[PDB]
């Protein structure tokens, strides 16, 4: 019964760490892209 329960409860260490690394990468890329996106059109318009 211990094994059976563990087959339901336990998350996988490797899978979760992989997911975390991936999500961190996505988050950094997203913030960078957002900064870029905000910043260019405003100044292009500004100079016009």
């Amino acid at each position: 019964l211990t094994s059976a329960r563990s087959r339901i409860e336990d998350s996988d260490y490797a899978t979760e760490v992989s997911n975390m690394s991936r999500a961190q990468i996505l988050q950094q890329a997203g913030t960078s892209v957002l900064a870029q996106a905000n910043q260019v059109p405003q100044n292009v318009l500004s100079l016009l």
């Binding site: 260490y13 490797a14 760490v17 690394s21």
Partner: protein, 49 residues
Amino acid sequence: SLTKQYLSVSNSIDETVARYKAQFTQLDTMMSKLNNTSSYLTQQFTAMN
């Protein structure tokens, strides 16, 4: 009478030792897997450094 009594208790002891043995084996396997996990975790987190 003492002989038969001794036989009984010795058989009981044999049983109990056998009972302990299987728990030992299970502990061994689970420990192996847990050590593998721990090594992986330390490695990966040291990498994320």
